[model samples]
Target chain A: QPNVDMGFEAAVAKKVVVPITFMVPNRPSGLTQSALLVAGRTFLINEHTWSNPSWTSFTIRGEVHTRDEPFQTVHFTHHGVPTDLMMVRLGPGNSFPNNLDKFGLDQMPARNSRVVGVSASYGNFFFSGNFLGFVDSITSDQGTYARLFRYRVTTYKGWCGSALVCEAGGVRRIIGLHSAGAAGIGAGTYISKLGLIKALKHLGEP
Target chain B: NVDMGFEAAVAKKVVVPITFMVPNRPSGLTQSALLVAGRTFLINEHTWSNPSWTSFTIRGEVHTRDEPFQTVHFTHHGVPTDLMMVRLGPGNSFPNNLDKFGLDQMPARNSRVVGVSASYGNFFFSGNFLGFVDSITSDQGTYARLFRYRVTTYKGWCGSALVCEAGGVRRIIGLHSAGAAGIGAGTYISKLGLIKALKHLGEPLA
Candidate 1:
C-alpha cells in the first residue's frame, strides 16, 4: 500500500532517464531484433541460447521528452526478443546502492498491492492513475534478485521501459519497470534496489 | 502464415475452473450425507416418490471428498442443494486390467483418447473423467457452496487428487461456480495440457 497524495510529486521528481546497450545472441531464427534490460541486467528472450562469437549491439538512452518528442537517437543491435527494461543510475552524486542484501531495499508488497506509473498510455502521459495494481507472483535468481508483478492497467504500446512506483506514508518507491501488458495479459519485472546500486556503482556517480 | 503459426504456438496457456453442483429438485429426496461409492455419491434419506419423499436422485458421482465416508453437503435456505457432482468421468473406460478392480476403469492408457466433459447448462459435465455438476443454475444462491469428492484411485483423480491429498481436500476443492464463467472448457483443457507437458518436461519420472 502507498500513501497516494504525499508521494506522487516525489516520484515524478525522482524520475530519471536510463540508457543501455545490448549484445544479441545468434540463433537459427537469425539475430534477435532487441534485448530486454532491467536495472543493469539483460535477458535474451528471442534466442534459445547464446553462442560464441555472437555480438549484436543496441543502445537505449532515456530522454525527458514527452510522447510527441522523437526518441533521443541511439542505435544498437540486439540478438533476441526485446524486453522493455532499462538501466538507470541514482542521482549524480550518491553512494551506488547494491542488491537488497547490500542496499537494504525493502521487498515489494505481496499480490494486490496498489501500483502507479507515469508513462505514455495510448499516446498520452498518465502520471497519476490508480490504473495499475500488482500481483507478487515472480522471483529472480540473478545476483540482483527481483520479483515479478502483474499490472492491471492498459499500457501504451510504446510505454515500455517506464517506471512503476509504490507510495505509502508520503514515501514513493520505484519498485519495477514497465515491460509489456495488453491483449488481456500483463507482465513486468521488479527493479531491485541492489541492482540500482550496482548500476550506480558502475557509473561511479558520487 | 508461418509467423502467425509461430505466435499461436507460443501462446501461453491459462486455466479457468467451471464448477457445477447437482440440483435438488422439489420432488427429489434429500441425501443425509454424501457417500463414496467406489467414486463419490450423495445418499438421500427422503423418499423421491412421496410428497414427504421431497427427495430426488440427481444421479452424479462425487468427483472428490474432503473426509472419507462423510456426507458432502451444500445448502440453500436450510435445504440441501441436491447432491453436488464435483466431477464426472469421460464415460470411456480403459481396457480391462488388474487396476480396474479398485477403480472405475483402468486409467486411460494413452491419455489422449480420454475425452473431458465440456457441456454447458445446468448439471452439464465438463473436463475429463472427473467433471462437476452444480446444484443451482442461477449465479446467485444462498448457502455458501463447498466442494467434496473422493479419490477412488490415485491415477484417475489426476492433479486435483494429488493436490488435495498433499494439501488437504479443502485446499484443493473449490466451487466451480465461483471462478470464471463460460463452461470452463478452456480451463479444463489447459489444466490437462499442463499435466501432460509437466510429465514430459523433466527427466523420465524417477
Candidate 2:
C-alpha cells in the first residue's frame, strides 16, 4: 500500500476501521459491525447497532471481552436529545492500529467530487465515488442524527461507522460516518456537525 | 410481503433456514440455505471451512452426527465469492415438496429481487437492482461475480436465497453472501458446481 490515492484510502481503512462484536452475557449469540477508531481505545458506533446499551454487556474487538473487562459507555450529544452516534471506550490490553488525525470537511465537496467510503466489512472493503453533498434532514423512525450528509458510495453491513473520506491537498479527511445506504445512495451523520464537535471536545480531540 | 411465486417456493421448501454450531460455543450461528437439488444445499463457503463448525441443522432438524456430509467449495484461488454446496449424508433427505429452481441468468439492472431468511418466521426483504460486480473477495478466498441489490438483510440471512421472478416463474438468482448498509451482495449460482455435485451424487442436473 502506497500513499497515493486509493492506496491511501486503503491504508486509512486498515488503521482506523475495526470489527466490533456485541455479546449478551451467557449467550454466544453476537452481532458484528465496523466502528471508527477516533482515539486510543475510543471508537464510534452507529445508534442502530447500540441503541439499547443494556442489551450488550461487553463487546469484542479483536480480543474477547470478559464481563466487566471494559465499561461499555454510551454517549449522546445532549440529555434526551437523540442522535445517531454512540462512543465506546475500550479497556487496557487492546490497542488500535491507528487513529484519524483529522475529522470534518475543510471545504464543501463540489457535486461529483472524488471521495472514498471505507469500512471493515468482515474485513476492510472500500469503493470510490463522487461526493453528492447534503440533502434535507428528516426524522427517521429508525434513529435520528443531529445533522446528515449524503454521498454516493457502495456500502455493505458492518459499514454503520464507516469513514467517508475525501482527499484535500493530497491529505485525506474524514467528512462523515456512514449511517445507512441503499443502491448507490448513502447517508450518515456529518462528522463536522456541531454535535460531533462537542462530542469530540468531550474526548479532548478537535 | 406478498408474492405467490415466492410463497409457493417457500411452501415447497426450496429455501431452508439453518443453524451452524461448533462444540462448546454457547450459541449456534443462524443462517439460511437454499436447496438447489436432491439433498444438497448451497451456502457461503466461509461457514464451511471453520474447523469448529461441527454441528449443523436444516429446518431445525439436526444433521446426523458422524455422517460426514459431502461438500464441494470454490474460491477460484483468489477474491472468494464464498460459494459452497453441501449434500446431506444418507437418510437426511429433503421433503418431497422440495423442488429445484432454474439456473440463474445475469439479472437485469434495477430489477426487483427478494431475500428470504428464517428466525421466528420466514422473513422476506425486497430490494431493487444495484447492478453487478465482476469479482468479489472474502477472507475465505475469492472468485467469480456477484449480484448486487439494495435489499436490507440481517446477519442470519447469510446464505439465504436471492429469489426473483423470471418469465412468471421463480428463480434462485443467487445466494445471499454479504450485506451492509442496506446493500446485499450474492454469488450467482455456479452451474459448474451444480453439475459436479450432481455427478458426485450420481444424479442428473435438473
Candidate 3:
C-alpha cells in the first residue's frame, strides 16, 4: 500500500504547521518539533534549537506529505545566537500554514493570549495535541533577559522548537516557538522582534 | 492552533489488553468487537478479540478515567473479519475529547486511498503511522472480510482502531488484527458485518 498524495504537509493537514529537526555526526537528530510556516517561504523556530549546535550534518525536515517530503539543507547564518527566536526560508513560497501569515516584519502577539503547543516527540512521527498552555508574559532585550515571552505550557525538551499557536474565531496563529522546559515551565523568544525579522529576510539558499 | 484537542481525540488510546478470552465470555481489553448485544458489557464474533479502552489516568486520577464499557455478543470463528465493540456502561463513557467513530461505512474509489492507525497501550505509543488500502477482500474460510494497509507494525496494538474519516468525521472503518491478518500483517477488518452488530445493539451511532 502506497501513501496518499495530498497537498497538505503530512496527513495531518494544516496550512500553517510544519515538522522540523536536525541530525549530527555520532548521534541521532535534534528533538523533532513543529515549526511555523509563513509567507515568503519562511519558517519560525527557536533560535537556540536551530543554532549553537555541533553537528556534522544538518537538514530542515518540512512539508511532509504522503509521497514527497520536501526538505532544505541548512547553513546556520551568524545571527540571533541564543536569542530564542529566528526564521528561515527558501526562495519562493508555495503555501502558508492554515493559510495565515500575520507574523512577519513587525508583528507580535499580545499579553495573556491562550495558545496550543504541538510537536512530534517521544519517538513518534506524529503529534498528540497536548494542552501546551498559554502565553502569560513578555520581556524586552533592554532588560536582563533578551526579548522573550513566557507561555505557561508543559514543555518537554524533546519539542524545543515547536509552535505555540493561538486561535481566535476559527483561524490559528503562531504565538511563539517553544524553547526550554524546567520542572514544568517553558519559554521561547518573540518572533516579530527586529532581529528575528531581519534574520528571516533570507533571499538565497544555503 | 484551533486547539479543539482534536488530535488527542483521533489518537484515542486506552486498553486493558484481553490477556485471554473464553468463547461467549469475558474479555480483558483491546479487542475489536462482537455481534450479539448483551445486557452488560460483552464480547463476540465477525469479531476479533476482547480489547482495551482508551481511558488514561491523567491529571485528576491514576488509571482513573472514563471509557466505553464493552458488551460483546457472539463470534463466528473462520469468519475472519475480526472486529467488535461493546456498549458504553452507565457511568463509563468514551473520553470527552475524542470524536465518535463513523458507522457501517467504506472508503470511496480513488484507489490510492490511505488511513490512520494510532495505537497506545499501558506503556507507550505502540504504533502510529499511515498506509494505503490495497483492496477490500472477503472470505468463506472463516469470514475474513479484511482489507490491506501498509504500516510500520509493532506490539501491544491489537484491536487498535483502523479509522478513516468521512465527511470530516472519523469512522472506525476497520480493526487491525496484527498481521496480514491483524495490525501486524497490515490487514484490517472491514466494517461489513460491523453495522449489523450495531443494529443488534441499542441505537445506530449517528
Candidate 4:
C-alpha cells in the first residue's frame, strides 16, 4: 500500500529516521542503530559509533545498501575535539522525497515541554515525553565527552542515534540526537548548537 | 500556516462539542464528538454515566426527545471500553457543508495522528507522533483492540475523534478514551464488537 501522508511529524519520521547496521571484526552479530537524515543521501549519527573499524550498510524506507556501498563520514568537531556529531555521506541518489527545509532547526525546549523521539532502530517507533532540560557535559560509552540534553522517554540500546524532535502548529524541529540512556532517563546531544548548517555547507551535495 | 485542509475539514465540519444531560443532574458533561454519518455522532462512552434518563446537545443545540442511537459496552482487559452513538433530533439538520467522515482501519504503528477536542465548549486540535495499535484480551478471552498513543490528554479530550491519514484519506480510526503519565489510549473504532454493534444499529460503515 502507498504510505499515507500524516502531516509534518509523520513526514519527518518517514523521511528523516534512518537505520544503519555495522558488523564488528570477529563478531557474529551486527549492531543496528538509528540516524537522522538531514540532506540528500546524507544523515547524522553519533560520531562515537563510526570510530570503530567495521563493515557498514544502511536502509531507508525500503532501499537497502550493501556492505560494499562506499560512504564517507564527516565528524563535527570544535577545536580538534569530537562533538559527538557525525554526518554520513552516501553515494548520490534520491536523498528524500521532500525538501530539507521541512525539518526545522529549533531552540532548546523549555523544561517539561513535550517532545517526540523517533527511533529507526525500534522500527521507527515514536517515543513521546517531556524535556527534562540539559546537562553541561556527559561521558559517552566510547569515553568521549560532550554536552547533552535530557528527557524522560522509553529508549533501548540501539536507539543511540535517534532524533529528538519538537513539533507545533504543523512545524517539526530537530532539537537533539539520542546519544545515551540511563536509569530511566534518555539523553541526546543537542543539535541546534552544533553548527549543523556550516557542516552541511562544508559537505556539499550528497 | 493553519491551512491544514484535513484539520479544517474535521474541526469545522465534522467535529462538535456535545453535552449529555441526565434528568435531575446539576449540569451536563461535555466532550467532543465526530459526525461519522448522517445525523450520527460517535463518542467515548466514558464521557457520560450511560444514564437511562437522558437528553443531549451537539454544538450546544438541545436534543431532548431521544436517547443514544446506539450504546456499546465492550469487554476488555482493564477498563471497559464503552462507545456511544448519538444523533440529532427532529428538525435538527447538519450544515450543508458538513464533510462526511469515514471509519478506517487502524493506522500504521508509530505514525502521527490528529485529534480535535472540545474544552469548555471550544474546539482544540492536538496531535500524537507515535503509538501502538494493539489488542488486549477480554475477560471472556476475546480480543479487544485499541490504539495507544504516547500523549497526555485531558478530560475534555475524552471522546475526541482520533483521525489519521489512512490509504491517502483522513479517517476516524479511534476515539480518545483516557490517559495518564504521558500514555493515552483510545478505543479503536474498527473492533469486531463495535462493528457488530454499529451494524446492529444500522449505521453505515465507510
Candidate 5:
C-alpha cells in the first residue's frame, strides 16, 4: 500500500500521569525490606516492580496534546519490566478527541519511505524533533511481535520511553517506542500493528 | 603615643556619598526635553531630582569588651558613576607628628589594590585590581592612601593631587579637594576596597 499521510496521529499523543505503591512479597526478612513503586499517567496499561517499593513513588506529568489544543493531564500506573511498553488510548472521554485508527498501520511503507518520531519523555512537555529513517523490518522477540527501525538519533538522560512516529505531510504514526540501547546511542522498539489489531479486536473497538 | 587604634579601626573603609551633575545643553535638547516634559507633567513640580536611597540593616549580637556598646551604627552610601577606583591602605594610622617615619618607604605596590567601575562593579570588594596605580602608599608616618585617578587626555589634569603635611615626607592625604577631590577620594578608595573584600568572601560568613 502506498504510504498515506493521516493527520490524526499527532492528535492522539496524550499527557499521562502515573502513581505507584510497593509491598514486600517475602516474609520475615521482607519485614525489614520493602520495595519502591511509582505510578502516574504515563503507566497507562502497564505495571512496575521494585525491590524497595515502599519507600518512594513518582507522579510524572507531561504534554501529550497536539500542537493545537492546550496540553491536558492524564493519569496512569507505572508497571515494571517485561511489559514496560504500554498503550494510551485517546478519544472523546480522553483529553484528545482524535482516534488512533486513522494511521492504518496494516501495511508497510513503500520502499525508501521517510518516517519521524515525536515523543515527550520525562517531564519535558516539548516534542523532540528528531525522526528515524528506515523502510520496515518486523520481527518477533520472545513471542512478542515488534518492528525495528534504524535511526541515527541521539537520546539523552530524560528521553527514555518516548514514542517514534512517522512524519510525512505533517502526519505522524506510532512506529516504535524509545527503549534501551548502548550508552551514547539511540534506538527504539516498534510495536507491530498485528498485535495492536488483535488487542483492538479483543476490546471490540473499530 | 596616642594609640586610638584609628589605623586598625579604619582598616576596613566605608562607602561615601557622591554627587555629579548632568548638564543641559541647547544642542542636545530633544531627548532630554521630551523626558523632562514627561516627568514635569506626571510628577510633582517641586521635585528636582529623584532623591531616593535604598537602606538595609544587619543586626546581630557581636561580642565586645565588658561595657555594652549597645547599638553600633554604620552607614553606607551608593554612588552612581560610569567609572570609579578604590585604594586599599596599610594597617596603620596617618601619622601626622612623626619626622622621617620609617613606614613611609614601603611601596603600596600589589598590596591589595581594588578598582571599581559601573560596568564591572558587581565584584566590588573582591580584592581584584583594575591594573592602574603601581602603589597606593603615601609618604612617611602617614596612613596608607588611596589615590583616585580619572582617565584624562590632558597630561596635567590626569593624575592625583599632592597634600603637604608638617612632619616627614610631604604626605598626599588624598586627591586634590577641588572638583573630584577631598573626602570623595578617601570614601571612594575605602568603599572600593571593602567591596572587593566582601565580594571575595562571597555570601556572608556564619
Candidate 6:
C-alpha cells in the first residue's frame, strides 16, 4: 500500500492548463486524456469510462513544466470510478500531494456563465492545439446518472470526458466533464453538483 | 486487423516487455484490470512491493495469463505520448525497408496507413486502416501539434505504431491511442515521428 501523505493535496487543479490535456499514457486498450482536477487522489483526473471500463494502478503523468517533471510522475492508482466521477490515488513511490485530503468541490454558476470544454481534440491532443469549447447550457441535476449540459465548441469523438471549465475572473473553476458533443453542442456531468461531489467523496483520496 | 501473415521477422526477436510492473502479484490483472475480476485475493496469492519503473521479462512469446497480478493499476505515466517505439535491441537488425521515423505533416485526412499492434502475445495485429489527422480532445499540452488515425483499436493494439510504406520504406509516423466511439470507435494516433523516439531509446533508426 502506498503511504499517501495527508498533507499532500494532489496538485492537479493548480495546472488547469496541463490537467485538461494529460495523457493516460499506459493502458490495456491504448492512450486517452485525464480531463480535469487533482482530487480523488490523482495528480490529474479524467472521465472514468464510468459504467464502462476502469483502470488498474498505472502511473499517469501529472502536469509538469520543465521543473515539474519527474515529480510530474507520482506513483498513483486509478481507484476506480465509485460512481461517475473518475478518481486518482498516490502509489508506492509518491504520496498524496498537499491539500489532497481536502480536495475541493465544484459548483454551478449562472445560466449563461462563460464555460470552456477542455480535453484532447480529435485524438492527438498533446501535439495539437487546445480544443476549447464554451458551455452555453448546464442541464440535469444530481443522480440522473446522465447529467446534461450543452456547450458550443468544435469537438470531436475523443473529446468525451473533458473538463468543462469557467474562466470567470481568470480563476478556472471546473464545472463538469465534457460528456457528449455534436455539430457544436457539448455536454457532460456537473463536477460541482452536490451529489457528484459527494460521489467523489465516496472514492476517498490517497 | 485480422489474420496476420508473416514474412521475414523484423529482428527475429521483440524486446519491449510489459512496461507495467505490479509490486507483487501477476502483472496481468494489474495491466488489464479485467483479468483480475470475479477473483480477488489473487489466484497466485502474490502481491507486488512498490512500483518504480516499467519492467518486462524477455521471453520467447507473450501470453495472457489467468491469474494476473490482480492488482489495481493506478497510472500509465510512461505513456508520454500515444507513441510506442520498438528496437531490435543489441542483437537484431530492424528492417531498412521500413521508413524509420520522420516528421511528416500528418497523414492526409482519410488516407490509408498501415499499423502494427502487439496488443496481445506471440502475435501482432497489423492492417491498413483509414486515416484522420484526429482533431483530438487531449488533456495534455505536450502535443503542441497532433495527428491520429482511426481503425478498430483493440486491447492488444494500444501502443502500436502507425506506419506507411511509401516508395519502398515502411516508416512510422503516428502511434495508436484510444478509441473515439466508446472504445469501439476507430483507433486514434499521435505524431510520434518514430525516428525521434527510437533515438531516445538509444537505437538507430532503421
lDDT digits (tens) for residues B53-111 of candidate 2 = 77776744676446777777755445456688777755556653233444455556677
Give the distance in Å from residue B44's predicted Cα in candidate 3 to where it truly belongs: 28
Q: How many angstroms is residue B126 displaced in model 2 relative to the true structure, after the best TM-score fit?
A: 4.8
Quote model 2's iRMS. 6.9
- Give lDDT: candidate 6, residue B67: 26
lDDT of 3: 0.40
- What local lDDT score does residue A76 receive in model 5, on the 0 to 100 scale? 21
* Candidate 5 per-residue lDDT over residues A141-184, each given as its tens digit: 53322334545544432244455555454344665555433333
True contacts kept of each: 0.00, 0.05, 0.00, 0.00, 0.00, 0.00
Q: Model 1 over residues A1-206: C-alpha lDDT tens digits?
A: 83337344343323332222223231111111222222232221211112113444333332121223221221111233222334433222232222232112265453445666544211114433442444434333422212446656644323444456664443456565565555434555555555545544454433
DockQ of 6: 0.04
Q: Return the TM-score for candidate 2, rounded to 2 decimals.
A: 0.61
Error of 6 at B65 (Å): 33
Off by over 4 Å in 5: A1-55, A60-84, A87-98, A102-104, A110-112, A122-147, A167-172, A181-185, A197-206, B1-202
Give the 10-residue window scoring lowest on summed lDDT in candidate 6 chain A: A72-81
- Show the colliding residue pairs in model 2: A156-B180, A157-B179, A157-B180, B78-B142, B79-B142, B79-B143, B80-B141, B80-B142
lDDT of 6 at A60: 37
Interface RMSD of each: 26.9, 6.9, 16.7, 24.2, 30.7, 11.0
Candidate 3 on B52-113: residue-level lDDT in tens? 33342211122312444343333444433444455544434433211234334454432222
All candidates: DockQ: 0.01, 0.13, 0.02, 0.01, 0.01, 0.04
Global Cα lDDT for candidate 5 = 0.27
Query: Which candidate model has the greater lDDT, 2 or 6?
Result: 2
| After superposition, candidate 4 runs with Cα above 4 Å error | A1-6, A25-29, A56-70, A78-80, A104-106, A167-172, B1-206
Model 5 lDDT at residue B51? 31
Of 1 and 3, the candidate ahead on lDDT is 3
How big is the positional error of residue B19 in model 4, measured in Å on the Cα after superposition? Answer: 50
Query: After superposition on all CA atoms, what RMSD does each candidate show versus the true structure?
Result: 20.8, 8.0, 19.7, 20.2, 23.4, 15.8
CA error at residue A52 for candidate 6, angstroms: 4.3
